[PDB]
Design a protein around this ligand. Structure first.
Ligand SMILES: Nc1ncnc2c1ncn2[C@@H]1O[C@H](COP(=O)(O)OP(=O)(O)OP(=O)(O)O)[C@@H](O)[C@H]1O
Ligand SMILES: [Mg+2]
Ligand SMILES: [Zn+2]
Ligand SMILES: [Zn+2]
Lengths: 256, 343, 51
DNA sequence: CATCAGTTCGAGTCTGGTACTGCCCAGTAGTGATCTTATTTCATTATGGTGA
């Protein structure tokens, strides 16, 4: 029954030893709100938030809540949305079925665009008031705007696709493929014992280049369109390809 | 077999109870009162008030429930093009476990029971306190004064135009605390019916006859129905009562049909023609017997849960007073002609 | 903080009760009192003159 | 030989991780005023039977 900003300021921030946590817990903790994306990241701030929530609640599986399991296989370069992403149809479905409205991790990914369960692109702006809201504000609430505070769901949303049969179907199929790939990734998180390493990408690239590219990179780079410098960086150094690039390569191989 | 199917015996006693408690019967009195009530509802003809007198525990609510379900399943085909029109509204709305009947509580309850059926988002009540919410419910405060609530309810009833405004246990409308007159309360309710144009069918027990005729305006606008009981003097009514008892026996969920017909007159001393009261007594007796796993109902079980003679004679006196107040005879007609001047 | 001090001084000199709202109403940026010292200075001046 | 593929150097661009500034509103508790209402008194008013 308290505002999430109040809970962060008066219950979490003093429990965090960082200087800026304690200082901003008394003048408006806008640092943690303007960068609510990084709370779900792979890095140290996300891990600290999980640790403090574990201390406050005494759980045992809050690491699966985020994709921190994959801090060695992903990269926060153009990965997380600055503004909220929600499926209104899922919001009503869960509200009308009597279940709890829960914000999904999959929505925070910039690559994800549509809801796999209700076949509609997510909304990135409040329909009632044309104002943007971050992933966690001072008055955030499941199913409500951070500024207007009214229900954002609908049985039928106000956004529809354009009329076109040339490339819209291909884009929708690509979006479905990406959403299913990320969903299977998250689902297999729990079953997997430990995350694959960067060396796993190294040997995977060594395999694929030596499978159909007969040990050449120019053909592969032209096939996927990425400049060969990035191909060398992926195949030789400890550089993790972007998720968009990763699953574009996967689509070129047509393998999850 | 016109009775209950023989496959309800292997099921546990809970299933037999769940089959019997929602099972209703059609006695001729119920059929005739339902017919007349449906007719006067369908054509009100400028009648602001309908009064439905009757005994307690006779089925006057089984009747209201049937009226609501029929009005719904009639208006449901008409709800595909007509918007914000509730087929039927039936409540109690008079002193819900309250010491004195309150007009503000009645208005707010009428509003919340008039709007909750439909999830509507375009209604603008003529008020600043009561409004809707994004979820579609009706939001009310404890600040709005009674005139504002009256305005809101009048606007809602005009926009929604329900067929009826069934109120139950209306005999407690007379709980006016102190310093008030009953004619003022009828004037307020008939006014609500006037500016709104709705039909208020006030049902309940014989106390209602308290209002029968207070003013001339009330007299001309009132349509009265008397859900009369079963009286042993009439032979065909005794035939109908025993037939109702047989019908109970044939649909009674037991391995074999027990012999309760022979005690018909005895049943009268425990029933007084109150078919509802007889149904509750039989249901309690059968529940008690089936708790001990008895396949038949005997006279001993009937005497175990039988009603008390003092209570029966008390309600008999009340019913006799009500009937002698309601009684109409040729002497009254002749007095009417004598007063009028028609020779 | 000084400006608040002369404002309360002059307001009491004329005769009106110097409150936070009245002092704010005659100072160009009446939102500086969120600073944890300006309000302290105003309260200290009020206590010094006896409120 | 001159074309194309495997390697380098350094700049472009995002983003997390860390700290900080300039500013008035909103809620609550005092009083004094003015209605407002479920509930407690001040008269008349009708009913009663019998000894002068
Ligand atoms: N014809 C009937 N068939 C089956 N059950 C009946 C019948 N009539 C009444 N009942 C039973 O009567 C019970 C409710 O009481 P009932 O409706 O008879 O009283 P009511 O006189 O209408 O009430 P109230 O005096 O409060 O208005 C229910 O258990 C219902 O099953
Ligand atoms: Mg009833
Ligand atoms: Zn959805
Ligand atoms: Zn909003």
């Amino acid at each position: 029954g308290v505002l999430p900003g109040v809970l962060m300021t008066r219950e979490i921030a003093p429990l965090v030893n960082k200087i800026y946590f304690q200082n901003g817990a008394n003048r408006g903790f806008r640092e943690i709100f303007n960068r609510s994306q990084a709370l779900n990241g792979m890095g140290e701030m996300a891990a600290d938030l999980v640790q403090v929530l574990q201390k406050l609640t005494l759980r045992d599986d809050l690491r699966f809540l985020t994709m921190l399991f994959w801090s060695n296989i992903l990269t926060p370069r153009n990965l997380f949305r600055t503004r909220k992403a929600w499926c209104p149809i899922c919001y009503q479905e869960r509200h009308q079925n009597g279940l709890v409205v829960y914000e999904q991790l999959l929505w925070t990914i910039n690559l994800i665009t549509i809801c796999p369960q209700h076949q509609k692109p997510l909304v990135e702006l409040c329909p009632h008031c044309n104002h943007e809201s971050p992933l966690l504000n001072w008055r955030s609430r499941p199913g409500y705007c951070s500024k207007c505070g009214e229900w954002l769901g609908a049985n039928q949303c106000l956004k529809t696709f354009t009329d076109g049969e040339g490339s819209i179907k291909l884009q929708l199929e690509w979006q479905y493929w990406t959403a299913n790939v990320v969903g299977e990734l998250i689902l297999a998180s729990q079953c997997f014992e430990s995350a694959p390493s960067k060396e796993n990408i190294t040997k995977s690239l060594n395999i694929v280049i030596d499978k159909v590219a007969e040990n050449n990179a120019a053909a592969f780079s032209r096939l996927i369109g990425v400049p060969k410098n990035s191909l060398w960086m992926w195949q030789s150094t400890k550089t993790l390809p972007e998720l968009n690039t990763l699953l574009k390569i996967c689509y070129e191989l047509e393998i999850s | 077999s016109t009775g209950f199917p023989l496959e309800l015996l292997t099921r546990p006693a809970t299933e037999r109870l769940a089959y019997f408690e929602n099972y209703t019967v059609a006695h001729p009195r119920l059929k005739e009162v339902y017919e007349i009530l449906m007719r006067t509802i369908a054509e009100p003809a400028g009648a602001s008030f309908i009064f439905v007198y009757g005994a307690s525990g006779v089925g006057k609510t089984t009747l209201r429930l049937r009226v609501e379900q029929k009005l719904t399943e009639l208006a449901l085909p008409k709800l595909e093009s007509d918007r914000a029109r509730v087929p039927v509204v039936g409540i109690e709305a008079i002193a819900p476990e309250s010491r004195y009947f309150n007009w503000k509580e009645y208005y707010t309850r009428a509003l919340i029971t008039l709007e909750e059926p439909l999830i509507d988002h375009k209604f603008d009540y003529g008020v600043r306190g009561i409004s809707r919410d994004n979820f579609g419910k009706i939001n009310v405060e404890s600040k709005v004064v009674a005139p504002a609530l009256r305005r809101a309810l009048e606007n809602a009833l005009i926009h929604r135009h329900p067929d009826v405004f069934f109120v139950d246990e209306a005999q407690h409308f007379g709980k006016v605390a102190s310093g008030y007159k009953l004619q003022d309360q009828l004037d307020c309710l008939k006014s609500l019916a006037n500016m709104t144009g709705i039909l208020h069918c006030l049902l309940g027990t014989y106390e209602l006859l308290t209002f029968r005729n207070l003013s001339g305006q009330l007299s001309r606008r009132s349509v009265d129905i008397h859900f009369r009981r079963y009286c042993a003097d009439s032979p065909e009514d005794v035939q109908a009562f025993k037939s109702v008892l047989l019908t109970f026996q044939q649909h009674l969920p037991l391995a074999e049909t027990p012999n309760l017909v022979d005690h018909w007159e005895y049943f009268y001393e425990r029933t007084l023609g109150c078919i509802g009261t007889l149904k509750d007594w039989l249901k309690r007796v059968l529940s008690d017997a089936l708790d001990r796993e008895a396949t038949t109902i005997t006279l001993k079980d009937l005497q175990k849960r039988a009603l008390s003679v003092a209570q029966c004679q008390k309600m008999f006196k009340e019913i006799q007073e009500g009937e002698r107040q309601l009684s109409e005879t040729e002497a009254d007609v002749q007095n009417l002609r004598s007063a009028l001047g028609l020779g | 903080c000084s400006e608040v001090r002369e404002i309360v001084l002059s307001l009491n000199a004329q005769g009106v009760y110097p409150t936070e709202g009245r002092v704010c109403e005659l100072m160009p940026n009446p939102g500086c009192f969120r600073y944890k010292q300006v309000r302290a200075a105003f309260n200290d001046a009020r206590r010094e003159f006896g409120l």
